[PDB]
Design a protein around this ligand. Sequence first.
Ligand SMILES: COc1ccccc1-c1nnc(N)o1
Ligand SMILES: COc1ccccc1-c1nnc(N)o1
Lengths: 264, 265
Amino acid sequence: GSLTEDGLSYKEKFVVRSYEVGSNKTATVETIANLLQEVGCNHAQSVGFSATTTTMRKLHLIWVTARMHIEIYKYPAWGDVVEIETWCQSEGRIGTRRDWILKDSVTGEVTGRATSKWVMMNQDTRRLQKVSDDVRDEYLVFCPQEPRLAFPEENNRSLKKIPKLEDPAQYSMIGLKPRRADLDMNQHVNNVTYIGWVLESIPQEIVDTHELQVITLDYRRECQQDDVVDSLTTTTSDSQFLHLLRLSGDGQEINRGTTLWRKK
Amino acid sequence: GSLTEDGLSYKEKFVVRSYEVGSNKTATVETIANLLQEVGCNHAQSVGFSATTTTMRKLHLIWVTARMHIEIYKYPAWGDVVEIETWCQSEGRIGTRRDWILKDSVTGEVTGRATSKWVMMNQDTRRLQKVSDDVRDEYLVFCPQEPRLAFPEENNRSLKKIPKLEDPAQYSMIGLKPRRADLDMNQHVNNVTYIGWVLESIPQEIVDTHELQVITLDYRRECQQDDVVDSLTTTTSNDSQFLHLLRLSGDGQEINRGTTLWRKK
Ligand SMILES: COc1ccccc1-c1nnc(N)o1
Ligand SMILES: COc1ccccc1-c1nnc(N)o1
């Protein structure tokens, strides 16, 4: 991988692995989400991060994902090379945004796109906060100054408000628990695990006859390594679904989202 | 990746990813096991497969893993390049064996080794069988004729008989279920998922103060996508050794048995 000529974006090529594909012999949406995370990490390392800046480490502040939105036109097949371009942008004091463009390396055609919203949080108290003047000036030198959006369209799917699924759910998958492979290097549940858990309550008949086109996921609270999650889904319609992940006991919300599926 | 000069082994380099590492910023044993599976698949494709031979496809026969044995001296760190060499060998009519050597690409030093035993099974009936001459002759042109062993030694750990854990287990992790990410392209539970499930019953204190050195896992029966598994562990021992058992949550039917050896950090 490498930064582009202007040093304001990053590109990396990936060869899709045998264990990374589903029954259609193409990359799962979890594989795509892990590759997005990987190219984002390689971008941060390339621009000097040990994505916490000097003032952030001093104040015990970190970036946390508030929303992930992914749209796939074509899933890359096993053995195919996919090229991903990523960049970050300042969203004033609200937070930051990371965008991605996925392309088929052979044809150069856009096969997917993603966007994510990140907020600032104190790592010890878990208290969200606005982005200060000091932390913003030290990361603006790594972002394009003019807007560069993966989802330019005014009022597009990436910015839609998501409602809360009301009981009873049409479908459910109960008692989901993370294992050590689901954790990251900081012993926290990887954000991609939550996408998998959301997808667990979609019926197998939908998965067998449809391809996932769009997924929007809001992150409200973390699952601890000793928590148990229930995944709920209701059809709201192409086929569209509303999703809810909540703790198995008290029913505390951890995520809400929507998926759009196209008939094969 | 590419076949070596003689066309009897295959090599591939991998850059360790951010999501592939644990708390020590080095590759988990599940990442290593997935890379072993990936280099094995790339080797089969490079020698003409799509690893079923023409006679196997005609008789609805497939290779299935009976045992996996992995020894790691050094886990590669995040961003490091690891090079893996793999090859297959005929074990007469019993089955086949796939071996691997892992090396640090920068130093050229051996950081790990693995070996696996595969048996022939009818895809539809699940009945194990010996390897016929017609099948053996079709794959021998892709294997070294003289023995090449990742674990040459006389009394080596890869061939040790594993006992059955007796109740009560010292530790346990109950109600483990596979999700769609745990399945392969054929909708079967990936063999690496079983390694993760075995490791779930090891106490977090062992994981925090020790590094996994050796793991031997026997595969007896597969977990269906609607089955539920219990993972059991008992200490059998500077070094810590454990005996493992994975069984179905209901009837207690065995699916795997294994052993792990851990050295203090
Ligand atoms: C690596 O992430 C963390 C580290 C420390 C404290 C919290 C987190 C976190 N991740 N997601 C949320 N909501 O908090
Ligand atoms: C892809 O694997 C299969 C396909 C068809 C039938 C059985 C298997 C299998 N894999 N492991 C065992 N024990 O059976």
